[PDB]
Structures are given as C-alpha cells and as structure tokens.
Amino acid sequence: AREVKLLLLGAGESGKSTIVKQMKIIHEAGYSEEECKQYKAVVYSNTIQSIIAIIRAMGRLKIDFGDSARADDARQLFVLAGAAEEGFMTAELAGVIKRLWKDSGVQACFNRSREYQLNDSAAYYLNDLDRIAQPNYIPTQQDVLRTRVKTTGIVETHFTFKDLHFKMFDVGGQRSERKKWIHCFEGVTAIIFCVALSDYDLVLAEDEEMNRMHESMKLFDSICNNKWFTDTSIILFLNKKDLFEEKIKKSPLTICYPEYAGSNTYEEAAAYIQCQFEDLNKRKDTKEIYTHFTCATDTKNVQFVFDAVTDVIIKNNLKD
Amino acid sequence: DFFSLILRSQAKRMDEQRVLL
Numbered sequence: 623a624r625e626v627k628l629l630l631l632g633a634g635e636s637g638k639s640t641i642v643k644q645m646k647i648i649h650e651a652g653y654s655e656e657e658c659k660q661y662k663a664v665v666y667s668n669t670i671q672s673i674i675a676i677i678r679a680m681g682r683l684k685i686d687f688g689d690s691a692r693a694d695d696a697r698q699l700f701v702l703a704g705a706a707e708e709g710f711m712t713a714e715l716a717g718v719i720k721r722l723w724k725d726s727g728v729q730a731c732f733n734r735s736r737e738y739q740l741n742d743s744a745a746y747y748l749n750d751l752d753r754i755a756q757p758n759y760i761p762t763q764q765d766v767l768r769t770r771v772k773t774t775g776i777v778e779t780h781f782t783f784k785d786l787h788f789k790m791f792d793v794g795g796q797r798s799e800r801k802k803w804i805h806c807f808e809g810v811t812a813i814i815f816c817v818a819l820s821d822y823d824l825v826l827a828e829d830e831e832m833n834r835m836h837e838s839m840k841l842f843d844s845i846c847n848n849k850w851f852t853d854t855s856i857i858l859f860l861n862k863k864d865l866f867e868e869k870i871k872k873s874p875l876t877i878c879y880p881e882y883a884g885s886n887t888y889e890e891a892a893a894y895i896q897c898q899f900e901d902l903n904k905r906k907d908t909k910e911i912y913t914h915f916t917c918a919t920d921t922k923n924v925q926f927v928f929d930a931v932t933d934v935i936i937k938n939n940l941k942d
Numbered sequence: 943d944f945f946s947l948i949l950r951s952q953a954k955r956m957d958e959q960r961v962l963l
C-alpha cells in the first residue's frame with residue numbers, strides 16, 4: 623500500500639479546517655456550484671456573527687461610536703440577526719452592517735482585536751459586503767474557504783495525488799466517538815502542526831496561564847517528543863504569515879517573548895519563532911522538523927507547500 | 943496528560959462565531 627496518513631494538529635483557530643477544505647479545492651475537484659449555494663446561509667451567518675462580535679466588544683472595551691446615530695443600527699442588528707437564516711440579506715440588513723462597518727468607533731475596535739476574540743474571516747467578509755449583499759449571489763470558492771463551520775467530530779478528506787492515496791484527518795476537539803478519535807493518532811505518516819503566527823500579540827486572557835503562542839508551544843513540545851511518534855514526520859506550518867507581517871510592523875515580538883533582543887522585521891521575527899518551536903524537539907539527531915511558512919487561505923501557497931511536503935514523503939519511502 | 947491537552951487545546955475556537963451545517 624502506497625497509502626499516506628496525515629494528521630492535522632494545532633490550537634483552535636490555527637488553520638486546520640482551512641487546510642482540509644484546501645485539499646478539496648486543490649486535489650479533489652473543488653466545490654460544485656450546488657455546494658457553493660449551500661454555503662450562502664453560512665457566509666451570511668458568519669458576516670452577521672463577525673459584526674456582532676465587534677459591536678459587543680465595544681461595550682466591554684468602552685469604545686463610543688463615531689456617530690451616535692449608529693446606536694440604532696446596533697439595536698437593529700440584533701432584531702434582524704435571524705433575517706437571513708434560510709434566505710436573503712434583505713436590503714435593510716445590508717444597510718445596517720454597511721453603515722456600522724464604516725463607522726470609526728467600530729473600526730477603532732476592529733484595530734484593537736488583539737484585546738478580545740475576533741475571528742479572522744471578519745475583515746474578509748465585511749469588506750466584500752456589497753458583493754455578497756446581491757440577491758443573485760453565489761459564493762465563490764474563496765468564499766467557501768473562508769466559511770466558519772462548527773464540527774462536532776472527526777473531519778476527514780482523501781485524495782490521490784502523485785500516485786499515492788492520501789488520508790487526512792483534522793481530529794478536532796470532540797472526544798465523543800473515542801476509539802475512532804484515538805485511531806487518528808495511529809499509523810500516521812506525518813503530523814502537520816499548525817501555528818497562528820498572528821497570535822503572538824494577543825493579550826494574555828483571564829483564562830490563560832501563559833500566552834497563546836506558549837500554549838501552542840507546549841502542545842508542540844508534547845506532540846514532537848511523544849514516543850509514539852518516533853517514526854512519524856513532524857511538519858510545522860507556521861501559518862497566518864500574511865497577518866503576522868502586518869502586525870509585526872507595529873506590535874513588537876517582545877509582547878510575546880520579552881527576552882527577544884532582535885528586531886521587528888517580518889524576517890527576523892519569523893525566524894525567531896521557528897527557533898522557539900524547533901528548539902522544543904529533544905531528539906535532534908534522530909529527528910528533524912519540516913518547517914513551512916504558510917497563508918492557509920491562499921490556495922496557490924498551500925498547493926506549493928503541500929507539493930513540497932509530498933516530495934519529502936516520496937524521497938522518504940525511497941529507503942526501499 | 944497528552945490526549946487531554948490536545949482535546950482542550952483544539953476545542954478552544956470561537957463557537958459564537960461559527961455555525962452548524
């Protein structure tokens with residue numbers, strides 16, 4: 623059997639579900655126009671959810687609206703919140719969102735997203751409001767990629783590429799159906815650990831004993847060094863590099879690593895993080911890590927990175 | 943514990959900003 627088992631791991635919001643969808647676009651035949659239609663309701667809901675999250679955050683952070691006229695829209699949003707659930711973004715609704723998203727109070731809060739929890743499909747959807755507001759609208763494949771869906775168990779995708787049968791599991795965060803879950807961790811060719819680089823500047827939340835980056839690290843530390851994984855490739859996806867590059871211009875990496883004596887260039891910071899992770903590997907003679915810098919929402923990039931990952935797998939099983 | 947740590951970690955998404963299918 624030329625069969626390859628790939629397990630995706632990493633904190634929530636690290637890009638795992640996206641990598642899965644992306645395999646479908648790249649190596650299966652994508653999403654058919656019918657399937658795209660099915661995500662219409664999802665796109666609408668996420669857009670609604672995203673703006674609500676910003677609005678609610680305004681209260682907590684105590685940020686006043688740019689124009690106090692928008693207060694009505696805030697109240698109106700909650701009334702209309704369900705207006706799209708099976709159908710259409712009525713015009714009224716588009717108006718509310720459009721006007722809120724434009725407001726400077728909202729925006730100042732959107733800038734301060736490190737201070738709360740704003741999903742990374744927010745900007746994407748809200749800036750394309752005009753396009754998705756159309757009654758005739760059919761979600762593009764880039765739109766389907768950007769959808770945020772609750773799953774309640776193991777996510778799987780399979781494809782054939784370069785004469786190899788690929789099985790990929792995003793095991794997710796649900797223990798229910800426990801034997802099949804544990805099995806995802808068994809007979810794995812390669813583990814692909816995802817990291818959201820852009821988490822580096824997130825405020826230490828009231829429910830955490832260390833920042834998100836160190837949480838990710840601790841996780842990687844235990845995966846990498848687990849004796850069950852001795853003969854499993856460890857592949858590291860330092861993801862969300864697009865957002866990381868923008869943030870690092872303004873927020874110092876010392877926010878995340880106080881001891882960091884380097885500089886706030888994308889290049890130098892990214893290299894520092896990679897080292898922070900790779901240094902966690904405690905069996906360096908018997909194991910190397912395969913680091914990749916990705917933007918998971920970018921098909922072309924994933925295609926290239928995954929192609930590379932495959933080539934290593936091929937060159938690997940030529941120990942026969 | 944190895945499996946716990948993973949479970950708890952990957953569960954921490956933003957579920958008020960996702961949706962059922």
Ligand SMILES: Nc1nc2c(ncn2[C@@H]2O[C@H](COP(=O)(O)OP(=O)(O)O)[C@@H](O)[C@H]2O)c(=O)[nH]1
Nearest residue numbers: 634635636637638639640742743862917918919
């Ligand atoms: N800008 C940007 N957004 C991303 C990137 N990777 C993922 N996202 C978005 O970030 C969020 C988390 O992605 P997801 O795959 O659902 O993470 P998971 O929680 O590990 O499954 C989603 O809104 C994605 O569409 C990236 O590299 N750049």
